[PDB]
């Protein structure tokens, strides 16, 4: 038979509910499971789905160049094949033989989907443009001025057409405001200003970080590109340290930082989390870099080319996408209100302001009129 070294990571390698009540390949399940199943159906061989010892993917020690992980297993004969989400790199290909990527991905941005924005003090003006509001104000005062001028500059046939046109105007204005506000309140379209990493680089209102150490952090250390150089400068020059300890830690930090944080991670895991309840996350923008997961096999073997051809036949047959849609989307768990004062507080502020203003004006007008009348 064949030795199939892997590692426990969902939705690739998962233990069924009856893992303890079963002793065999039926124990495990996920993407790579059906992948190896189809690979065997193509090549027609035997295989026992073992697991890696150190619970790692693969790397070397800078003091003894010893390969720890599935890489060490395939290099030191401990394994025969590694059907796992193993990233393809230069160092690893210099020693073993990778297959063509069966799953392409790249770094991506996870955030919390836009929650209902705070109403905002002067939000009732959003339905209309600022310029329209100023134009309305000045039209009102100008009309008042004209009404005043048609009383002292003349003894009506002038106030009539003026009243009619003002009626038309205020009618249309009321209607437009009501209609646009109703459209706003009915559908409630939600959007964020972050459709890419450039937006994050251009702002600092929200923070972003990465795993305390890993391929992503190293790529950001390197990648001497304007945007990514700026992002590395920010993340390194920022307190508190945006970095986190593990994936779930950053996920929760994003879940408890509604409008503050944004994590960078493999797009696959990002989609996985996005499809798992509570459904309080979302992946934004597009992949920053481009990488791929591919099968592994020692520098010299017999199933390498067969596995490559099988991967290509699957990718061209419309199978890998099916397994992905199954383990990510089909399995995916993530398949009006009244109006509060906070939405209109500005109206009452304006009212009280104008009211106190009128009161003060009347007070000074009286203090002048009565003073002039009595004293003279």
């Amino acid at each position: 038979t064949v030795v199939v070294t892997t590692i426990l990571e969902s939705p690739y390698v998962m233990m069924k509910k009856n893992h303890e009540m079963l002793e065999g390949n039926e124990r495990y399940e996920g993407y790579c499971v059906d992948l190896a199943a189809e690979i065997a159906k193509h090549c027609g061989f035997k295989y026992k789905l073992t697991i890696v010892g150190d619970g790692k993917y693969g790397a070397r020690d800078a003091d003894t160049k010893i390969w720890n992980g599935m890489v060490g297993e395939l290099v030191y004969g401990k394994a025969d094949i590694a059907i796992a989400p193993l990233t393809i790199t230069l160092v690893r290909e210099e020693v073993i033989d990778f297959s063509k990527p069966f799953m392409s991905l790249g770094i991506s941005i996870m955030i919390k989907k836009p929650q209902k924005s705070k109403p905002g003090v002067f939000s009732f003006l959003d339905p209309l443009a600022y310029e329209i509001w100023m134009c309305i104000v000045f039209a009102y005062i100008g009309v008042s001025v004209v009404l005043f001028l048609v009383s002292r500059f003349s003894p009506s046939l002038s106030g009539r057409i003026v009243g009619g046109v003002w009626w038309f105007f205020t009618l249309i204005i009321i209607s437009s405001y009501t209609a646009n506000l109703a459209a706003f309140l009915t559908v409630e379209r939600m959007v964020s200003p972050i459709e890419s990493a450039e937006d994050l680089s251009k702002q600092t209102e929200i923070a972003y970080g990465t795993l305390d150490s890993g391929s992503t952090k190293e790529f950001f250390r390197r990648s001497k590109i304007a945007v990514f150089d700026k992002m590395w400068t920010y993340m390194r020059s920022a307190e508190p340290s945006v970095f986190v300890r593990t994936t779930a830690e950053g996920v929760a930090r994003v879940r408890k930082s509604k409008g503050k944080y944004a994590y960078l991670l493999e797009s696959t895991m990002n989609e996985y989390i996005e499809q798992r309840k509570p459904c309080d996350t979302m992946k934004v923008g597009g992949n920053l870099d481009s990488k791929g997961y591919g099968i592994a096999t020692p520098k010299g073997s017999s199933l390498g080319n067969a596995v490559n051809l099988a991967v290509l036949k699957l990718n061209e047959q419309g199978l890998l996408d099916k397994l992905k849609n199954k383990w990510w989307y089909d399995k995916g768990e993530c398949g009006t209100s009244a109006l509060s004062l906070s939405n209109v507080a500005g109206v009452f502020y304006i009212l009280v302001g104008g009211l106190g203003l009128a009161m003060l004006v009347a007070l000074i007008e009286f203090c002048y009129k009565s003073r002039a009348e009595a004293k003279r």
Binding site: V352, L355, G356, S370
Partner: protein, 134 residues
């Protein structure tokens, strides 16, 4: 942070500013009359005019104070209303309780009243502040 009491409080601030102005005007008028106490008929007609303005400036007092108290009630407030109540009691008492000798008390009353309202003003502001951020 609105509480529905910030609106009542700021409205009370405005009305109390007007009321302080009116009280100062009343004090000044009473001082002018004390000083005053066909130029004789002129001064008589002048005190007639001032008394006319006074009588015209009575209903606003009751109106604004009743509004203050009823709005404080409708806003579930209970520590301020109880402080404005004595003034409403005094106002309703004035009817079945009430110029050379009247002023001997009137001035005093007016003066004190002003002070009260003034204090109230400050306090109102204080409240809305402690009610506008929490």
């Amino acid at each position: 942070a609105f509480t529905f009491a910030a609106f009542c409080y700021m409205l009370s601030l405005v009305l109390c500013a007007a009321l302080i102005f009116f009280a100062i005007w009343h004090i000044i008028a009473f001082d002018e009359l004390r000083t005053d106490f066909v130029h004789a008929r002129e001064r008589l007609r002048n005190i007639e005019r001032i008394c006319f303005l006074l009588r015209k400036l009575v209903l606003p007092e009751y109106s604004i104070h009743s509004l203050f108290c009823i709005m404080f009630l409708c806003a579930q407030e209970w520590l301020t209303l109880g402080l404005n109540v004595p003034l409403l009691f005094y106002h309703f008492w004035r009817y079945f309780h009430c110029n050379a000798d009247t002023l001997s008390y009137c001035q005093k009353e007016a003066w004190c009243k002003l002070a009260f309202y003034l204090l109230s003003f400050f306090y109102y502001l204080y409240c809305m502040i402690y009610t506008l951020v929490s």
